[PDB]
Amino acid sequence: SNAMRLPYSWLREVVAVGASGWDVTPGELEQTLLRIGHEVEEVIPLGPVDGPVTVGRVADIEELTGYKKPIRACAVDIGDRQYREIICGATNFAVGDLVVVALPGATLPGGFTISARKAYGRNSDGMICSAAELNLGADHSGILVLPPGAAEPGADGAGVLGLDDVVFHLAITPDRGYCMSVRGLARELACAYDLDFVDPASNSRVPPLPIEGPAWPLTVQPETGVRRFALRPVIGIDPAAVSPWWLQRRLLLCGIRATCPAVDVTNYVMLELGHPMHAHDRNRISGTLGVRFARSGETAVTLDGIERKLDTADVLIVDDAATAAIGGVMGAASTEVRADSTDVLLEAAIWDPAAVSRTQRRLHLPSEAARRYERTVDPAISVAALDRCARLLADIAGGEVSPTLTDWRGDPPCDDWSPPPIRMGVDVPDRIAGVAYPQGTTARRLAQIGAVVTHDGDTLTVTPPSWRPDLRQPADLVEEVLRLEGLEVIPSVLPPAPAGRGLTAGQQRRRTIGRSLALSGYVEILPTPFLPAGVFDLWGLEADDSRRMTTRVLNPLEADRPQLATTLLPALLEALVRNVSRGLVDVALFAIAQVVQPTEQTRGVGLIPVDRRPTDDEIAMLDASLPRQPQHVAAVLAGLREPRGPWGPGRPVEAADAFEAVRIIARASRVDVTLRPAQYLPWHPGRCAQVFVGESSVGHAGQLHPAVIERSGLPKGTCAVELNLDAIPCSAPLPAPRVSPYPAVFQDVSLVVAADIPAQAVADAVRAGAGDLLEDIALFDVFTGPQIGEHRKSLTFALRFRAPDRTLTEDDASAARDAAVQSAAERVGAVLRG
Amino acid sequence: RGLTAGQQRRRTIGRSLALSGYVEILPTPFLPAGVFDLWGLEADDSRRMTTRVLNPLEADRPQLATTLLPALLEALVRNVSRGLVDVALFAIAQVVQPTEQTRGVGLIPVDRRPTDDEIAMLDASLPRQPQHVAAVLAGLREPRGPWGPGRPVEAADAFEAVRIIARASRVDVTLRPAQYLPWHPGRCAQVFVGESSVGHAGQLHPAVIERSGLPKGTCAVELNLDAIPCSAPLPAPRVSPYPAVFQDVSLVVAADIPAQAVADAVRAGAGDLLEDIALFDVFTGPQIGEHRKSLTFALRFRAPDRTLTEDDASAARDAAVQSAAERVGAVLRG
Amino acid sequence: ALARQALAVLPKEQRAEAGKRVNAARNAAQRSYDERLATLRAERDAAVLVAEGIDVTLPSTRVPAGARHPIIMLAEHVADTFIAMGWELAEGPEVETEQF
Amino acid sequence: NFDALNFPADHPARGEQDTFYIAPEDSRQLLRTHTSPVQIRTLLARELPVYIISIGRTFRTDELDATHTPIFHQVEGLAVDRGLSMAHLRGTLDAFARAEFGPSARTRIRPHFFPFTEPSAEVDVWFANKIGGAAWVEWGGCGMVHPNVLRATGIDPDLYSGFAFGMGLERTLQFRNGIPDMRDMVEGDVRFSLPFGVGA
RNA sequence: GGCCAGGUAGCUCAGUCGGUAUGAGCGUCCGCCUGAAAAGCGGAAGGUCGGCGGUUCGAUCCCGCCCCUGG
Ligand SMILES: Nc1ccc2ccccc2n1
Ligand SMILES: [Mg+2]
Ligand SMILES: [Mg+2]
């Protein structure tokens, strides 16, 4: 879309007009183009060939019958008195055609040495070469046929083809549309090398043709954005004429195939000057030519014979009968030039770049004319390109240039296409670059690119040329001076940054969380934001589940995965399947990333004027139109949690390991969490816990549902955990511990509760009743023997009592233990073990 | 430029040890009264070459610390004596180690900057002050609970603390049996990085524990962080999309052969096809032989460009068995 | 399934009607299996809802409690404050010369 | 993402970048293609001077191969102050490259285009331990903040100037360590993360 | 946008233009074996042949539409 192919010989020729004898190596030229801001994607030299590679003429053709494909035994005239007998499998040539022959002893590109062979019962004293075999073009179907008059038989093939040339593959930035021609690139090289430049579109190089009257009646609708529309006819062209070899070759090296002279002229002038041209068969035009917007439901058939559904924003060229062209994109098949065309009407127009860009993108037609118009084409060279086309086409096709010319330039007619002048201080490029440029550097460089510079004290007044509409502000003028002087002259100075505050509390908490999980045996992954296809259906979620309210992507990489992630688990479970399915069956993955949870249907905010700062009310409006993106931490586990070794066979992953991951994230976040049983897919309803920080729910953890594991192809007993980090308040506790120098009292309490009673609820009740004397409590026994009734369990806690100012007695600790036993009896129905 | 590589490493060592169940303490530089006599060190022990303080707070404790262990073991005694019997402490601080008698440097004119020779002469007159990391453990390493009765502290826990420090320092370490007080000669390991000795670890001597009033089975670690070089490796792994081949091999060696030496010999012989090797069985008995042991390793082979046949993996396994035979005298179990 | 592959050896004029009998038997056993799969799956889903309940509050940390010293933590926080302002961390020996 | 950063409407400077748009069509909601919208968000909220970096995920419609990934991470740089110049941008890029490629890292800036910078440039790097031979490889884009961007945030371009840069973390990790397949950097195989150690 | 070639077991891939993919290598499982393993020998399981429809008594195979990859 932004490519620019051109051979160095053509580029050197245009530069050499103003700088005679200018010549550089392809390596140096690539460095210069890069130094001024032209990305060189490729540098491909032609050939190389060695030995006898000569131009020949097919004087006879014998069809060798009795094979798979048509095999031809050809008598080729290579310039001497002995015709060579060549065997060839191509069928794209006839008797009398000029071809390129590689004789025995030649070496084609690729190290292929040519010699005589015994092919198809006959001898092959060489071969007829194709464009691909000579490293000239991409054509490999048939052999290369030079146009008649390209050379005489016996001429050096490398010279006629110009195989010492080098084609340059450029990637032009969208701000330098003027560089999509030999004219612009040569002008850039003249600036970089401080050369005198002769504009190939100037009136000296393209002298104006006579203007004796209108060429064709034309009506232009001005609100279509057209800035110029010129027409000039060329009558009596020879239908049998073809373009010379130098023209067809330069088109080939630029990536354009030659068809007929009329079209070859327009494509050649487009490459030379940057102004797209089109040739209409004037004998097929019926009545007044009209430039207007397309109507609703209107269609048109282009050069390729494809019907195009047009939009009311598309600009058209029409006559009384049909549409003639999709403005700035492609002409129509009604006025196209074919074999019997004798009178042509050349069209030189300047279209609105936005209108062409919209139309070409809707119709998917990025033609050579479209990509140039959408990047603005110089409107001051329209007649010059028109006259260059007429004179060159009449010269090749043996026609006559009509002295008529229609040139619509707007209402009123515009005779000055200069952008508005720009005022800028003479030292502004020096301040932005931090470089003291020599006296007059700014004014010198700005005149080089073609601008008019006047001096008003210390302030310059710069009027950019018509082919540089990208120069609208002093910053644009600064880039011109800086890039031509070379960015390498800018020194390296560290900025005066002020004292910062460093990482935030949330940024530091994430570091601690990832460090703790990795140190605890977890492996970090990067979760993809695109959800898997139908994952929530595999999870068995309700149709109104909050996780299903997703944001969709219009153009995803995979059409079956457009929705964004409302939870980090599907991405982690997908990475877990990858590891398990490749030999790593004992895995523990974790991820820290944001999720996308819309709060409403997707709504957009209109364009706010950029010319000013948006007020805080509109900022709050743009933020409210965005889905909530909270920070989440999640992890999944499968297989062995503890690896096997000399100690034992290892421990498989269980739900308690997911709960331990919660306690690790809690400890890394300096908060206290409580775990309460909950039912929440895709977890096992009997092995699932809802995590709470105080009274706020922050996530879930435990073992996944066995049906979800089956439907998702996960390993058996896979556990998961997910927490909302933004739901956890950032805490910075300042503890003030006072160590007691007095001994402690150790006691164990055994309580019998129902099986459904959580063990933490028993410890919370024992702690609440014991009082301040309780220093530490730890559960170390859960007994469910036959002495304990059914659906009941015995829990034994290790209590440690210590006073801050005295030594306790056993009755002192037993008093707090009894009060703790009474509290457990009231809160969890505990019974002292008997 | 922010923190230096060493300073960043010291934070990682402190974070990793704390997350592994160790509690940081601040060690006092003044040695306990006759601590080396309680350790039973020889009179020519390099640690006995201490720098003495002229005016100490305690007249019986005037020597400065050549090792971090006496201060950590002293803090370990305080915790156990106050009801905290299951305790794991650690400390990261510098020690002092003179290479000669305390030599002073005369006054240098303050009216000017001392030259670089005078600065180097002032630094040479000071004892060597390298930064050490050390840890002590006693009682239960794993606390009891609903899972089971817990595991007491053993020498392997001190070796694991070395590996925790090595993983934090992004370096590889090798353990070799050594006799070095106050460690138990049968439960002591000398830590090496490359070919440089960096410290010792393991269970303490029973006589040292008895004379110092320490808990039975006390284990300790001490490394010289300045002896460990800084490293910033730049790995570039390539994940092979081809399936792996699982194989196990049992090898019989002498009892004194460390299991890491057999694993290294298997790695050296298996070649680049070996993706992972893990030891999961140590077996002894009359089927094996006296003063011998059988070690079984789980091998994972994988090629980066093809699927392997069982003969492909068995060839690399046989080359690993042959490498262990030449290196540690291993015999394929039959 | 063995009756399905036996149709390939049958004469062409017989595979039409003999096949029609095979599918009818094939769909008969398949339709009975599909419903039985759903009923047994529904029973499994209903079993985990009323049983298999664990105590999600049981202690899971088998690693003892560890902690860095608060003085080291304060020095760490003080260092991070000055590094964020562009400063660096210098070091010095504890045993110092009287010259310094 | 586009309008506040001087992206022209209906122009190849905006249409060339194929972006993930949020359904329905013409909703003006999209997945970010660069961490550059954080420039706008910072300039409206914070007070001048501003010296911020931003690290986050960015989304492009590129197919996942050995050297490209549709979802990658980018580090954004924005410095707005009184009297900032290209030399201050060059000084920041040199210090950044010296910290991630060693003391032998020397950069090279060549002109380029970005809708939000004028002048715009691309940064190349060169360190001693080059995995693929010592040569110039592309690192990221940079340049001075366009005055139209400052006007769209309420900053006077006559008093305040600023520069910027943007580099991909995924691209930086490749040629620094010599990683072969970028697919392994994102696919989440533990065989890729484990050789790097625990990390802290 | 073109006519094509591809999507096949857990991984990497053969193979079929109507009734069995007598699928391979590695992966999983069983037996002999070992204190417990692996190899070896001897054996099983596992694919709804990319998805949705259609044609057909019956579709990996024939038709249509769609999803994903290379030219
Ligand atoms: N994210 C990003 C990419 C390219 C930039 C170019 C210039 C300034 C800032 C940029 N940011
Ligand atoms: Mg510019
Ligand atoms: Mg496959």
Author numbering:
A (entry chain B): -2 to 831
B (entry chain E): 498 to 831
C (entry chain D): 42 to 141
D (entry chain A): 142 to 341
What does the paper say about this structure?
The protein-fragment interactions were analyzed using crystal structures for five of those fragments complexed with MtPheRS/tRNAPhe (DDD00107555 (D-555), DDD01008876 (D-876), DDD00805735 (D-735), DDD00079004 (D-004) and DDD00067116 (D-116)). All five fragments occupy the L-Phe site in the α subunit of the heterotetramer. The bicyclic quinoline, quinazoline and benzimidazole moieties of the fragments are completely enclosed in the L-Phe binding site. PIEDA showed that the phenyl ring or the bicyclic core of the fragments interact with residues αPhe255 and αPhe257 through hydrophobic interaction. FMO analysis showed a strong hydrogen bond between the proton of NH2 moiety in D-004 and residue αGlu217. Hydrophobic interactions with αAla305 are retained in fragments D-735, D-004 and D-116. However, the auxiliary pocket in the structures of PheRS with bound fragments was completely unoccupied offering an opportunity for fragment growth by adding hydrophobic substituents to explore the auxiliary pocket of MtPheRS.
At the same time, the β subunit is involved in the recognition of the cognate tRNA molecule and editing of mis-charged tRNA.
